[PDB]
């Protein structure tokens, strides 16, 4: 039976969105040759079906992002105290004095994985900047590969994360059910511990210790996010896969598919138009095959990202919006709490798990026959017996005397293998003896 607990906080990073890419086949296929379009239009809707598929992928990514982040109805305002029952919620909620509207943990996450393969950003073409600061600048390239910005901006994602954290800390575990039942954080933690099986005694009598352990775990998470290693790299791997796909597409664009040269506007100045039409058709076929391979790989990656986003949304609905009895699903041990955090093209959950420690071996007993009838324990499943002494809980020691309220009546003693003779206590007989006599 463990005697002391150890509040730990684990991290879990799951991508929910990918790079919304859009490749224009008008510039990729038939870059600058005006005679190339006459042969390109001969094929058909190869430039329309791929654009439709890419638009569908973008819509699916936007819908997955909305289903993952946007789950609450009302936007709960972030509290100004950020200190509930001893639990210091700093570096989690947006600071009212910080210039940025994000959190410290959110800033540390956005300052690690947002490298985006520094040096390869000029492969595609986008429009970086914001409308507020008037720093929006559009950039294009001759390859025609473009990346569409996501629907939900980073500010909206940070606002959704702040609303989720506020609904988890304040209003208890009800903002996901459909109402807002305000309740202090102390009773919330009491219910969180009761859902596991531990009574409110360990929660209330050791509230300061739990708050100190929570603050220590938060500080350890901050120190791990400050200086880190190859860990926390799912989003980085997704970005690297997208960059490698774009680089392979660009390389296959400038590749000779069994023709005179891989560069346009050169075979027309050295060969006859009817003779160069064959080479143009071969180059167009090779480019179309490369683009079809790219579209298939993008479809596979989009299906994978959609599955990961559905899994992350399920985890957020089960761990954040309540207390799930799922074993090794939210964190490592008992869930007991959850806190979501924003991340670039992903979600980083903070599972405040419950890990017991300081175990000690003790003798037990299946049943206790007092006066011919056995007494199986009702609530406390562990019959902690030095020499047939007490009855305790499962996850915490909590030494408590054995009474008739913790055990029920049963049959004889010759039916249980391991019956131990002991006396059961009842507050009725001494009280009656003191009242009458």
């Amino acid at each position: 039976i463990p005697t002391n607990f150890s509040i730990s906080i684990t991290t879990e990073v799951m991508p929910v969105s990918m790079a919304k890419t859009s490749v224009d086949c008008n510039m990729y296929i038939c870059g600058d040759s005006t005679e190339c379009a006459n042969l390109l239009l001969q094929y058909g809707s190869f430039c329309t079906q791929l654009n439709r598929a890419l638009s569908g992928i973008a819509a699916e990514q936007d819908r997955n992002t909305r289903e993952v982040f946007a789950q609450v109805k009302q936007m709960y305002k972030t509290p100004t105290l950020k200190y509930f029952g001893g639990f210091n919620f700093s570096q989690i909620l947006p600071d009212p004095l910080k210039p940025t509207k994000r959190s410290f943990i959110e800033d540390l996450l956005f300052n690690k994985v947002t490298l985006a393969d520094a040096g390869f950003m000029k492969q595609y073409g986008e429009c970086l900047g914001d409308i507020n600061a008037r720093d929006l600048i559009c950039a294009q390239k001759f390859n025609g590969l473009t990346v569409l910005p996501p629907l939900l901006t980073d500010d909206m994602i940070a606002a959704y994360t702040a609303a989720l954290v506020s609904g988890t800390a304040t209003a208890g575990w009800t903002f996901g059910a459909g109402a807002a039942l305000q309740i202090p954080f102390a009773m919330q933690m009491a219910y969180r511990f009761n859902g596991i099986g531990v009574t409110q005694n360990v929660l209330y009598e050791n509230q300061k210790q739990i708050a100190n352990q929570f603050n220590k775990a938060i500080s350890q998470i901050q120190e791990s996010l400050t200086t880190t290693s190859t860990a926390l790299g799912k989003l980085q791997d997704v970005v690297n896969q997208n960059a490698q796909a774009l680089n392979t597409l660009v390389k296959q664009l400038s590749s000779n598919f069994g023709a005179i040269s891989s560069v346009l506007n050169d075979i027309l100045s050295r060969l006859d138009p009817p003779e160069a039409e064959v080479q143009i058709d071969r180059l167009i076929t090779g480019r179309l095959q490369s683009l079809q391979t790219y579209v298939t790989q993008q479809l596979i990656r989009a299906a994978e990202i959609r599955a990961s986003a559905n899994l992350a949304a399920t985890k957020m609905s089960e761990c954040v919006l309540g207390q799930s009895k799922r074993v090794d699903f939210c964190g490592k041990g008992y869930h007991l709490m959850s806190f979501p955090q924003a991340a670039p093209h992903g979600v980083v959950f903070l599972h405040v798990t419950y890990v017991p420690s300081q175990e000690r071996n003790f003798t037990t007993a299946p049943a206790i026959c007092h006066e011919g009838k056995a007494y199986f324990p009702r609530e406390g499943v562990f019959v902690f017996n030095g020499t047939s002494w007490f009855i305790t809980q499962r996850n915490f020691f909590s030494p408590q005397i054995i009474t008739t309220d913790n055990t029920f009546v049963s049959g004889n003693c010759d039916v249980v293998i391991g019956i131990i003779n002991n006396t059961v206590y009842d507050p009725l007989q001494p009280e009656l003896d003191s009242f009458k006599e």
Partner: protein, 94 residues
Amino acid sequence: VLYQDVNCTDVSTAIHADQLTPAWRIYSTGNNVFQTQAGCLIGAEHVDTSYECDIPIGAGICASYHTVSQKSIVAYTMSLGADSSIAYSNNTIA
């Protein structure tokens, strides 16, 4: 019109000087709006209100069909959610 990736400055010049490839005969231009990945939304007024996202466009600027003065297409900030007044209290139970 929702021109995917442009500065919405050369497109207007190409339209006014007949330099764009898609040349619609019955087409005009009265007002252009520029946001992050705008699309040069010619026809909609950049209203400073906040309505529910009906037609998602991108970068947090959706479109819909509401009344202006009357029925016209507008642009808003998706109206992320209605504000609440749930305040923490260590002595209040709901």
